[PDB]
Amino acid sequence: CVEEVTTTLEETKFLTENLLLYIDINGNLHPDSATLVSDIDITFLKKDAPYIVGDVVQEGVLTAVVIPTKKAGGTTEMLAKALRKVPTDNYITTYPGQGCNGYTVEEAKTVLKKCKSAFYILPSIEILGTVSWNLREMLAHAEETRKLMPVCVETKAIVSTIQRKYKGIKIQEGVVDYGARFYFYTSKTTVASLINTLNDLNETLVTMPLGYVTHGLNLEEAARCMRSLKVPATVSVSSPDAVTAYNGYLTS
Ligand SMILES: [Li+]
């Protein structure tokens, strides 16, 4: 009932056209699902928001289910309960509950072995060492390695430091390659959208944990989100004790 495939989305459609996508209660796509809806109208996902966990929406070849997140009380049984609402069918999908939602692959496997449906699981397509580097250190590293450095534009202390270092830089949201290569973002976009952007750019990162403070996440919550990155990243945390903490959060 559950089979992992080695193929891309397009290379897996010969088995079924149906895609199972994961959304949150506002109808926003999980980063694992967000890359699967090219050239398809997805207005229907958010049109009927807000949802509750377990709600299912469908249009054409797409099915989407609202899954729980452990930051908001979610457990393994609530994940299983949510997936039971999906109509029985054959689907291409990803393992439910990964990334920010905080479930492990082994937990996702457990949920899907209930298998009213058949699922073909797309491949999740390298872990650089976690460090505790200050902003000056992170900038110098970026400059010489050409790694992409995400920066939250609302963090005034960082923006001013960059302006001093790189006289003449015009900081604006998006990629800015001046002195070093930056991805400037607002906390007024989702963490998922930022992760998908970084994954699409397909560059190695030097970064603080994404969502941590800027999007109200604690360190464990950010570490869960960081699992959705598909690019290598040097992750710089607040202190040496946080290195130990972060690495533990990432592996559970
Ligand atoms: Li973005």
Q: How far is the CA of 190 from the centre of ligand 1 (A)?
A: 8
Cβ count near 169 (within 10 Å):
17
Same-domain check for residues 224 and 207: yes
Residue 159, domain extent:
130-251
Same-domain check for residues 84 and 168: no
Resolution in A: 1.6
Same-domain check for residues 8 and 70: yes
Helix (H, G, I), strand (E, B) or coil at 99: helix
Q: How far is the CA of 87 from the centre of ligand 1 (A)?
A: 33
Resolved by:
X-ray
Contacts (Cβ under 8 Å, ≥6 apart) of 209: 217, 219, 222, 223, 225, 226, 235, 237, 246
Q: How far is the CA of 174 from the centre of ligand 1 (A)?
A: 7
Same-domain check for residues 116 and 137: no
Quick one: tokens of 127? Answer: 């872990």
Q: Which of 79, 104, 121 is the last residue of a domain?
A: 121
CA angle, 97 as apex, 91 and 98 as ends, to 5°?
105
Closest listed residue to residue 131, CA positions, set 221, 248, 245, 234 = 234
Q: Which of 104, 121, 138 is the last residue of a domain?
A: 121
Q: How far is the CA of 111 from the centre of ligand 1 (A)?
A: 31
Same-domain check for residues 113 and 145: no
CATH of the domain at 30: 3.40.220.30
Lookup result for tokens 């533990």: 248
Helix (H, G, I), strand (E, B) or coil at 234: strand
C-beta of residue 211 within 8 angstroms of C-beta of residue 218: no
Q: How far is the CA of 91 from the centre of ligand 1 (A)?
A: 29
Q: Which of 94, 121, 148 is the last residue of a domain?
A: 121
Q: How far is the CA of 60 from the centre of ligand 1 (A)?
A: 28
Contacts (Cβ under 8 Å, ≥6 apart) of 161: 135, 136, 139
Q: How far is the CA of 149 from the centre of ligand 1 (A)?
A: 13
Same-domain check for residues 77 and 9: yes
Q: How far is the CA of 193 from the centre of ligand 1 (A)?
A: 5
Closest listed residue to residue 207, CA positions, set 100, 124, 130 = 130
- Gaps in the chain after residue (C–N beyond 2.5 Å): 125
CATH of the domain at 168: 3.40.220.20
C-beta of residue 56 within 8 angstroms of C-beta of residue 81: no
Q: How far is the CA of 251 from the centre of ligand 1 (A)?
A: 26
Same-domain check for residues 209 and 151: yes
C-beta of residue 199 within 8 angstroms of C-beta of residue 31: yes
CA angle, 228 as apex, 225 and 233 as ends, to 5°?
90
Same-domain check for residues 160 and 81: no
Distance between CA atoms of 96 and 80, rounded to whole angstroms? 10
C-beta of residue 177 within 8 angstroms of C-beta of residue 147: no
Longest Cα pair distance anywhere in the chain, in angstroms?
60
Look at the chain and report how many structural domains it folds into: 2
Same-domain check for residues 89 and 163: no
DSSP string over 156-179? HHHHHHHHHHSTT----SEEEEES
Contacts (Cβ under 8 Å, ≥6 apart) of 121: 2, 3, 4, 5, 93, 94, 95
Distance between CA atoms of 95 and 108, rounded to whole angstroms? 6
Same-domain check for residues 49 and 147: no
Number of H-type helices and E-type strands within the chain: 9, 11
Same-domain check for residues 114 and 28: yes
C-beta of residue 173 within 8 angstroms of C-beta of residue 186: yes
Q: How far is the CA of 185 from the centre of ligand 1 (A)?
A: 6
Q: How far is the CA of 197 from the centre of ligand 1 (A)?
A: 5
Distance between CA atoms of 185 and 232, rounded to whole angstroms? 19
Same-domain check for residues 157 and 220: yes
Q: How far is the CA of 74 from the centre of ligand 1 (A)?
A: 27
Distance between CA atoms of 191 and 197, rounded to whole angstroms? 10
Q: How far is the CA of 71 from the centre of ligand 1 (A)?
A: 23
